[PDB]
Design a protein around this ligand. Structure first.
Ligand SMILES: Nc1ncnc2c1ncn2[C@@H]1O[C@H](COP(=O)(O)OP(=O)(O)O)[C@@H](O)[C@H]1O
Lengths: 247, 264, 241, 246, 232, 249, 238, 241
């Protein structure tokens, strides 16, 4: 009954189970990566990330898990921070040039399709393309943003192609515990300030250290202000707000 | 007994009740029977009697039925040593078996060998795994010295049967011994009825004759073909509980069973 | 196993291998330390005193500037380090050409990592067995900064950092001494901070060191062999007992 | 089956002198359906041992014959796509000929082309032999022809032909007709004997229900073009065998 | 060890291909989808699986053109390749000839693509089977697709995980819904008792179902969402 | 008893040698003998031939070949990796040196070109070298006569008198004992034969060999007479009847 | 161990193996032909075996008249042979259009053999499992035979053979030439040379033949061609 | 599974075992020596074989030339050595015709070394196994002496050697060297080492060749002198073998 160990050293080989393995392993790299959260009210979307303090002498804004990718869109890396840069350089090369070939603003569902049209470039190209990569690259973005067609939504873009419109995502070192309990803390009728609370809460149960203005980060979207992330100062005052509330 | 039949020197199968040849069998009459018959000449010349022979060709030829048969005429002990069934994975113990039999043959007064599929000895050595192929010559080379050392006997004859001749080119072992290397035939169309006359005997069948048999035997020229056709053609007259063969079953047999004898 | 003899496959834990094996090569190399004061940067090296047949007329040099407001230091192996240094200084003088404007340091640092990302992704290629770091000042400002780079292709911004032999002793050391509660101001303490940092490795050999610092307004200055030899002593002057 | 280490790729001769990978392809068509074609005095004919999956199949909308422009026909057994990627080159290859030499295509020179397009696909290592056994024939200025095609590339000029499961049945059921009819045949006296053969062939597979298709090209009854059948011809040609057997 | 199955260049030791034969178990670990025919109007239905108790569902039906569509089953991202491919041919044989592309011609060349990946060293087979429908100047049709190349023209079939629990409904009731015409309101009802025999307690929520239909005087169009509680 | 490093030619062993170029040379031995001697006025080349089927017209093949009117060559090794090598060689004499320097090459700037035909084989894997090892003889006005050798590894020696093939070590021993640094031409031919006697089988006549020489001008070969300095070759191979008589001594 | 599944690898003893397998893969037909010169001509015979009874025997042929004054008889399996005969029917345009006149046989073997040499330095293609024999009537050097092979050792035989019965035919032929001490054959008539050839070979292996079981090629000057069942009784008529 | 079959693979221990298996190849090669001193640079050699019927008399093997200024010494493979010098002889002239002056020696080796790095990673190709010595004179740095390594890293030495048993020969040079030697102190030094660490007791004039650089051009640039046999068989007997 010879096992999986043989048909797992090549991107282009199935197994008698009927499946691939390399793509199935790529999903097991974001697991190593730090957390990431995204949940969407009607008033606005938020995010949330751990930053994995390695030592106390790193300017924490040196590394970024959040991008002002456009006027009305954001992202959230989780996994290999390197190969993410091969997406967004292609992503916000689309949201711009769509303002050229159509002189208007973009819709996400092209964008999340565009990046997911890219990740599968290691094999058959969608638009009859060719190959440019030997290595499906492991990160799991969260394309939050606004269109005037359906409003405020987010997504989950694997390297394995397909996407999903979650109403509440969580991916990284915490997808097992967090996304279990968002299923009993999601309301269609939230505020914004009913949102940044729990995303700090959930990000507390999940990880190692006690919180701080430095060992976290988060942002919110709104159609008029855009991808407005929060300073360390402002974020610090919600953390205190949790405590006196928690009493 | 432990190993092989040895034929008690007299179990007298007919070397002529056979559709084989006359030239080859008479070529062998020289190297074996003439000295054992007539030592007055090899003595007179002082040449020592011969050292073995090879009988190439693939089966159907009957390249083992003649051997024990002529051995039965002279009356020596016929045994086997199929090299496929002699190799052993261990370092030695392929050469030990060689050493037993040259000794054990001499435990008997006369004895003659019938090696077969001896290409297992004579390999091209294309793998070149020196842990192995250094030993393959080791057991082989022992044969060369175990076979002709001090043995000045006129009884211990040697035979080696080797389908696929010249597959061996690590060493052709030409010089000296192998005083013949018989140009083996295949069963010619003329020999078919020479052969069918053999096995058809000992039957009451209303004859069962035809000239549509060599055409049927064309390309099925192997002795097993005729042994088996007479077998199954014998099983068709009983297919209806008849009393004697019809020759159409022969024209049916060879036509309809050489199929496996031509495709695989 | 067999999951580690290439760059285009993942182990079932999800992580590639040929990259972080580079981190074992760079561990076999010499130290390379850097610190930023309030208004001046420094850089170190674990230079060797091999033998009395290298020409004293030309000492070797880990450090290698690319433009008058940027420098670079590394450790690992030198051959694969020589290339990207030349692809760097080429790229900077192009940015002066096309844009009539010098380089923001962040732009440079994403070009050297922008090659360490392709030289591992597309097979038929071996990585650059080197980690590096960048140091200098932006034009038209005093903002100090240094960036690190590593063959996985990622860029961080430490305030102090090292690479190579017994770095683990040092990156914990400066954490015990250096801190943002009190950022240094000028050279003689950033250097008095640093020259003592080397001592885990230097085993008391002062023919085994070099050093540089940084200016605003697109300048630099190297340093002598006696101009440390006193600093060998003030640092030992505290070590009376 | 004898040799083991030398099966993993094309372009490897076994020491006997034989490339086994091709020796494995032709063991596929033997696991494929049956098709035939026999030469007439005037033209030629074709048949096929079509199969089914259920009654769900659209009757007479899943043809297995494929055609070439200048009154030339083709049929292939085995893995049907490879036999279709090959004839797809046929309609591509004649327009490289009649465009230039002002004339429709001869059959033998055409067979040479397909008879060595295959050869390239057993002359490299990064390819696979076509797992089919194709049949094709038709008409030209110098009469009618027929051929047979095989992944080794060794085509031949036959009188009649067969492949698939039903070789040995039609190995003799066709051999008779060359004995009884040295004078040749017409298409009318042929198709009344071809659909005979297909039903003789299905006897090996009495469970797997079937269907039947015929094609025929002659200069007498069609004036030199390749036409299918229809109407009360196959409706009775079947009955030239449906009653002949039982 | 079933060797000779490292890539689609090698044959079996008999005449079989294993990488292909291993692809066909990919469709078997996807969802189900089904398709019927009438002599005027055809239809297809598919249950689309979630990702959790909160996610969206999977875009499973896709308009390649107006007179023709499809319904996948199995690996989806490799289907988007084919879906883009039809969308070019159909947008090629109308800028040049202006003719409505015959639905049967589509499957008559997809097979000429799944083959040319089967041959050479590199890439894979298109590891998905799928269904095609369409009206044309000849009449309605249904054409399926399995990765090995062989397409087939049918009255109605289904594929995916636990689908033969629907095929028997068809083989049992085939003679009825083929003469039917003019009234799609009940043909569309047919698949629903055809598919509901083939479930793991799924129970067919309105969100959990997609329907597409074509016809002579009707364009291709998707019915999902609250407009499908009707056809429960 | 070698393993794991003769598989290819792009993996240095720990011992520090390349894989199978050492093994290409193993055939070079197993080919027929050969030799060549440098005199003070000329150079000689010679090989036998063990023509398998005697029915072959042995005249058709030629171990020796032309490269120029002034340069000639011979191998000791594989055959069909020679008759292509020469066309790949003399094609280089034209396009490389001649049409950008007017006249024909010297020997070494024609031998160095042969090497660059060779090393291009040992550059990658799964692409074998040439199973031969050559020697070249020629003349020029700068340094005169020379006798070079070429190996499949790209290397190229000079020599003074040499043999290769089977009778390599045996012959080269004899040459050291039957040579002088200031001899003449004709005695050289009296050596090569009785050197070629060393590892001969079958016959020894002028039909079953082919040897050539180089020396003074041979304008009878020219045919384009009427010109002062348009002088003719320095190359000619000796007819069997011209050899079968020399053998008589 | 490797060394066998690849072409461009030498064994440590020098001899590679893969071509030697192709040298052995010629005689899967059990066919043996024969060629022999004349005084102004040359002829080639060829044994035939069409056992099954559905092959139009006219088209089965291991002969390919490539152009005027050239001929070729092959061994090895048929499909590789067509893949060689094509290239011959291609060059004879070029050498004519490029250098002016028709190809002699010797060049045509020299050229073709270099191509099969190049497939013993790299994995472009496998080597053809053929060993083929060209014939002609030269305008300068007269009739000629040349015996190619896969690796590319071509030579010119005065009159040679091929198949699994080379040793036998190698025996009796040279016996004939030493009964007269001449390379070629006298008796100009290319017709009458056939009667010489066939009777020289029936007795060689010892089997009488029909007219529907051979095929022959004839090389007169100004043309090469093939012939059907004419002149099929004079060998026994006298 | 051991990490040697291709040169595009780091080891888990952080090293590239194929490259070490090239740097060991030169050990099979022949000795080479250079010394840097006051008046001008000197070089030596030792042919691997010194048999009878092959002339090493007029045919230099170990001492090619790159320009009238610069000359080198060579080791290792021979087929993978000519193409380097046949590149160097090009790059220099392609530096001259554009800039109308001579080459600085540092740029050449910097450009000749970084191609050997090119044959270390990008592709499944052999690294050129060669250990040149570089000898020459540039104005911005005066006399010069560099050394290469088939990795691609160089070094500016004073007097070193390579080839067979250099490790001992260095010990015969490290301690018995004086910077103020003019020429002949290095000669009797140099020729004394090869006399000590040879293979056989011949030391015949054919076995070895020398060379020199000299600034003896009185305000002219430089001269060379590659010695014929008659200039070196007379000197060793003039030196006391
Ligand atoms: N010349 C022959 N005449 C009659 N029968 C023969 C002949 N040759 C072989 N046989 C039959 O074949 C059998 C011998 O098989 P054989 O070919 O000797 O096997 P192997 O070749 O392996 O020794 C005998 O039992 C005999 O019936």
């Amino acid at each position: 009954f010879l096992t999986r160990s043989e048909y797992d050293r090549g991107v282009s080989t199935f197994s008698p189970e009927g499946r691939l393995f390399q793509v199935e392993y790529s999903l097991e790299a974001i697991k190593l990566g730090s957390t990431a959260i995204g949940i969407a009210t009607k008033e606005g979307v938020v995010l949330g990330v751990e930053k994995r303090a390695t030592s106390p002498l790193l300017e924490s804004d040196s590394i970024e898990k959040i991008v002002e990718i456009d006027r009305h869109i954001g992202c959230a890396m989780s996994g290999l921070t390197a190969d993410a840069r091969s997406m967004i350089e292609h992503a916000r090369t689309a949201a711009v040039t769509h303002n050229l070939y159509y002189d208007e603003d973009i819709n996400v569902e092209s964008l999340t399709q565009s990046v997911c049209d890219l990740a599968l470039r290691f094999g058959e190209g969608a638009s009859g393309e060719e190959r440019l990569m030997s290595r499906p690259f492991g990160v799991a973005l969260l394309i939050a943003g606004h269109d005037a067609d359906d409003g405020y939504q987010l997504f989950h873009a694997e390297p394995s192609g397909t996407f999903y419109r979650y109403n509440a995502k969580a991916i990284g070192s915490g997808s097992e515990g967090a996304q279990a309990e968002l299923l009993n803390e999601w309301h269609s009728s939230l505020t914004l300030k009913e949102a940044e609370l729990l995303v700090l809460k959930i990000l507390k149960q999940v990880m190692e250290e006690k919180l701080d203005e430095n060992n976290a980060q988060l942002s919110c979207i709104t159609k008029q202000d855009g991808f407005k992330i929060y300073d360390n100062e402002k974020t610090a005052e919600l953390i205190k707000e949790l405590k006196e509330k928690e009493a | 007994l432990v190993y092989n039949m040895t034929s008690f020197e007299q179990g007298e199968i007919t070397f002529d009740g056979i559709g084989g040849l006359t030239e080859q069998i008479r070529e062998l009459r020289e190297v074996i029977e003439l000295p054992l018959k007539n030592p007055e000449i090899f003595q007179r010349v002082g040449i020592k009697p011969p050292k073995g022979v090879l009988l190439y060709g693939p089966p159907g030829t009957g390249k083992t039925l003649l051997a024990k048969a002529v051995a039965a005429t002279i009356g020596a002990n016929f045994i086997f040593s199929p090299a496929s069934g002699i190799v052993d994975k261990y370092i030695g113990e392929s050469a030990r078996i060689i050493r037993e039999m040259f000794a054990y043959a001499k435990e008997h007064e006369p004895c003659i060998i019938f090696m077969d599929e001896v290409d297992a000895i004579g390999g091209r050595r294309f793998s070149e795994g020196t842990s192995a192929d250094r030993e393959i010559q080791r057991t082989l080379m022992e044969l060369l010295t175990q076979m002709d050392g001090f043995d000045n006997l006129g009884q211990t004859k040697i035979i080696m049967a080797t389908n696929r001749p010249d597959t061996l080119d690590p060493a052709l072992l030409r010089p000296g011994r192998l005083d013949r290397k018989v140009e083996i035939p295949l069963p010619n169309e003329a020999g078919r009825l020479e052969i069918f006359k053999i096995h058809t005997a000992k039957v009451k069948k209303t004859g069962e004759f035809d000239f549509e048999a060599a055409v049927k035997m064309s390309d099925g020229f192997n002795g097993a073909d005729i042994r088996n056709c007479a077998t199954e053609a014998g099983f068709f007259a009983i297919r209806d509980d008849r009393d004697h063969i019809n020759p159409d079953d022969l024209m049916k047999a060879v036509r309809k069973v050489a199929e496996v004898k031509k495709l695989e | 196993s067999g999951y580690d003899r290439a760059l285009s496959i993942f182990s079932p834990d999800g992580h590639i291998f040929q990259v972080e094996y580079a981190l074992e090569a760079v561990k076999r190399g010499t130290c390379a330390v850097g610190v930023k004061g309030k208004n001046c940067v420094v850089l170190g090296c674990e230079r060797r005193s091999t033998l009395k047949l290298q020409d004293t007329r030309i000492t070797p040099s880990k450090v290698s500037k690319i433009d008058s407001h940027v420098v670079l230091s590394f450790s690992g192996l030198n051959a694969d380090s020589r290339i990207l240094i030349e692809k760097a200084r080429v790229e900077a003088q192009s940015h002066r050409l096309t844009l009539e404007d010098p380089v923001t340091v962040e732009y440079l640092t994403r070009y050297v990592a922008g090659v360490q990302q392709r030289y591992t992704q597309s097979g038929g290629v071996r990585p650059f067995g080197v980690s590096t770091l960048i140091a200098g000042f932006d034009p038209r400002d005093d903002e100090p900064k240094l960036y690190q780079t590593e063959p996985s292709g990622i860029y961080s911004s430490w305030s102090a950092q090292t690479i190579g032999r017994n770095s683990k002793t040092v990156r914990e050391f400066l954490e015990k001494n250096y801190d943002r509660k009190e950022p240094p101001a000028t050279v003689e303490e950033c250097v008095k901070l640093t020259v003592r940092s080397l001592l885990e490795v230097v085993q008391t050999g002062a023919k085994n060191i070099e050093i540089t610092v940084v200016k605003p307004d697109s300048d630099i200055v190297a340093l002598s062999s006696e101009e440390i030899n006193q600093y060998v002593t003030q640092i030992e002057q505290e070590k009376q007992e | 089956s004898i040799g083991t280490g030398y099966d993993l790729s094309n372009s490897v001769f076994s020491p006997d002198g034989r490339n086994f990978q091709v020796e494995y392809a032709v063991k596929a068509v033997e696991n494929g359906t049956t098709s035939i074609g026999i030469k007439c005095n005037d033209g030629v004919v074709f048949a096929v041992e079509k199969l089914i999956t259920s009654k769900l199949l659209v009757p007479q909308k899943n043809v297995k014959i494929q055609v070439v422009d200048r009154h030339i026909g083709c049929v292939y057994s085995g893995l049907i796509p490879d036999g279709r990627h090959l004839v797809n080159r046929g309609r591509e290859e004649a327009a490289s000929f009649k465009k230039l030499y002002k004339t429709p295509i001869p059959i033998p020179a055409f067979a040479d082309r397909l008879g060595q397009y295959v050869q390239a696909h057993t002359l490299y290592n990064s390819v696979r032999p076509f797992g089919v056994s194709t049949i094709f024939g038709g008409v030209d200025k110098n009469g009618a022809h027929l051929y047979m095609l095989e992944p080794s590339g060794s085509y031949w000029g036959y009188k009649g032909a067969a492949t698939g499961k039903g070789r040995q049945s039609a190995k003799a059921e066709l051999e008779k007709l060359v004995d009884h009819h040295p004078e040749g045949l017409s298409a009318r006296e042929a198709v009344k004997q071809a659909a005979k053969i297909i039903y003789l062939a299905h006897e090996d597979n009495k469970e797997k229900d079937f269907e039947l298709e015929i094609s025929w090209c002659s200069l007498s009854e069609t004036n030199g073009l390749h036409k299918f059948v229809k109407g009360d011809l196959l409706q009775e040609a079947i009955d030239f065998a449906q009653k002949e057997i039982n | 060890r079933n060797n000779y199955d490292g890539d689609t260049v090698t044959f079996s030791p008999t005449g079989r291909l294993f990488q292909v034969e291993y692809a066909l178990e990919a469709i078997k670990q996807g969802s189900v989808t089904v398709g019927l025919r009438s002599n005027t109007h055809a239809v297809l239905v598919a249950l689309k699986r979630n990702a959790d108790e909160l996610s969206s569902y999977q875009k499973k039906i896709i308009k390649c053109d107006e007179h023709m569509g499809l319904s996948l089953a199995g690996l989806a991202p490799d289907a988007r390749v084919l879906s883009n491919y039809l969308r070019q041919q159909c947008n090629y044989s109308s800028l040049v000839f202006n003719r409505k592309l015959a639905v049967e011609r589509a499957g008559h060349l997809l097979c000429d693509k799944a083959q040319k990946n089967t041959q050479s060293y590199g890439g894979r087979p298109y590891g998905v089977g799928l269904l095609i429908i369409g009206y044309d100047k000849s009449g309605a049709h249904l054409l399926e697709f399995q990765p090995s190349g062989n397409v087939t023209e049918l009255y109605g079939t289904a594929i995916g995980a636990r689908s033969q629990g629907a095929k028997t409904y068809l083989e049992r009731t085939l003679d009825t819904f083929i003469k039917i015409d003019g009234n799609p309101d009940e043909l569309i009802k047919a698949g629903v008792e055809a598919i509901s025999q083939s479930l793991r307690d799924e129970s067919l929520t309105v969100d959990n179902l997609s329907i597409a239909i074509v016809g002579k005087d009707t364009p291709f169009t998707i019915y999902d969402g609250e407009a499908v509680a009707k056809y429960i | 008893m070698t393993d794991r490093y003769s598989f290819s030619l792009t993996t240095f062993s720990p011992s520090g040698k390349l894989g199978q170029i050492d093994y290409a040379l193993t055939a070079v031995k197993q080919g027929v003998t050969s030799l060549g001697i440098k005199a003070t006025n000329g150079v000689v080349i010679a090989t036998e031939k063990k023509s398998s089927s005697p029915l072959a017209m042995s005249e058709t093949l030629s171990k020796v070949s032309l490269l120029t009117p002034d340069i000639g060559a011979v191998y000791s090794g594989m055959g069909p990796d020679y008759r292509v090598l020469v066309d790949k060689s003399r094609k280089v004499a034209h396009t490389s040196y001649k049409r950008i320097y007017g006249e024909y090459p010297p020997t070494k700037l024609l031998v160095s070109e042969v090497a660059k035909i060779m090393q291009e084989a040992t550059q990658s894997g799964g692409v074998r070298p040439f199973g031969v090892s050559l020697l070249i003889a020629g003349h020029d006005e700068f340094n005169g006569f020379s006798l070079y050798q070429v190996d499949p590894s790209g290397s190229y020696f000079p020599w003074k008198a040499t043999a290769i093939g089977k009778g390599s070590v045996a012959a080269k021993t004899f040459l050291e004992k039957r040579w002088n640094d200031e001899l003449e031409l004709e005695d050289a031919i009296h050596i090569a034969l009785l050197t070629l006697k060393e590892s001969v089988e079958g016959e020894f006549n002028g039909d079953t060999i082919e040897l050539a020489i180089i020396g003074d001008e041979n304008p009878d070969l020219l045919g384009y007479t009427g010109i002062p300095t348009d002088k003719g070759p320095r190359f000619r191979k000796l007819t069997s009847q011209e050899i079968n008589d020399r053998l008589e001594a | 161990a490797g060394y066998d599944r690849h072409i461009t690898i030498f064994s440590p003893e020098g001899r590679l193996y893969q071509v030697e397998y192709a040298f052995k893969a010629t005689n899967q037909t059990n066919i043996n032909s024969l060629a022999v010169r004349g005084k102004d001509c040359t002829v080639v015979i060829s044994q035939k075996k069409v056992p099954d009874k559905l092959l139009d025997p006219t088209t089965v042929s291991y002969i390919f008249c490539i152009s005027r004054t050239i001929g070729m008889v092959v061994n090895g399996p048929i499909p590789d042979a067509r893949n060689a005969a094509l290239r011959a029917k291609a060059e004879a345009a070029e050498f004519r259009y490029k250098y002016g006149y028709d190809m002699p046989c010797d060049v045509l073997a020299k050229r073709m053999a270099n191509l099969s040499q190049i497939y013993t330095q790299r994995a472009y293609m496998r080597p053809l499992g053929v060993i083929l024999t060209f014939v002609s009537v030269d305008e300068e050097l007269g009739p000629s035979i040349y015996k190619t092979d896969p690796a590319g050792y071509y030579v010119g035989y005065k009159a040679t053979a091929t198949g699994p019965k080379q040793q036998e035919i190698t025996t009796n032929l040279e016996n004939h030439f030493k009964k007269s001490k001449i390379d070629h054959i006298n008796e100009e008539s290319w017709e009458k040379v056939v009667e010489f050839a066939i009777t020289h070979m029936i007795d060689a292996l010892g089997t009488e033949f029909s007219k529907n079981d051979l095929e022959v090629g004839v090389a007169t000057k100004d043309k090469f061609f093939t012939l059907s069942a004419e002149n099929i009784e004079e060998r026994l008529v006298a | 599974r051991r990490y040697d079959s291709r040169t595009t693979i780091f080891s888990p221990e952080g090293r590239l075992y194929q490259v070490e298996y090239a740097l060991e190849s030169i050990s099979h090669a022949g000795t080479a020596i250079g010394i840097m001193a006051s008046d001008g640079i000197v070089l030596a050699a030792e042919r691997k074989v010194t048999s009878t019927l092959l002339e090493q008399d007029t045919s230099t093997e170990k001492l090619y030339k790159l320009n009238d200024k610069i000359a080198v010494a060579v080791a290792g493979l021979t087929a993978d050595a000519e193409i380097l010098i046949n590149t160097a002889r090009i790059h220099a002239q392609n530096y001259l015709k554009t800039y109308n002056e001579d080459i600085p020696v540092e740029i050449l080796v910097r450009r000749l070394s970084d191609i050997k790095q090119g044959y270390t990673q990008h592709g499944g190709l052999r690294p050129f196994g060669v250990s040149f010595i570089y000898a020459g004179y540039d104005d911005r740095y005066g006399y010069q002496l560099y050394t290469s390594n088939p990795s691609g890293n160089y070094t500016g030495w004073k007097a070193i050697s390579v080839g067979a048993n250099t490790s001992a020969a260095q010990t015969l040079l490290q301690m018995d060297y004086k910077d103020d030697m003019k020429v002949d102190d290095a000669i009797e030094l140099a020729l004394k080492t090869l006399s000590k660490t040879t293979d056989s007791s011949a030391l015949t004039y054919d076995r070895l060749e020398f060379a020199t650089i000299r600034k003896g051009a009185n305000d002219g640039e430089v001269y060379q002198k590659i010695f014929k046999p008659q200039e070196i068989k007379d000197i060793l007997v003039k030196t006391g073998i």
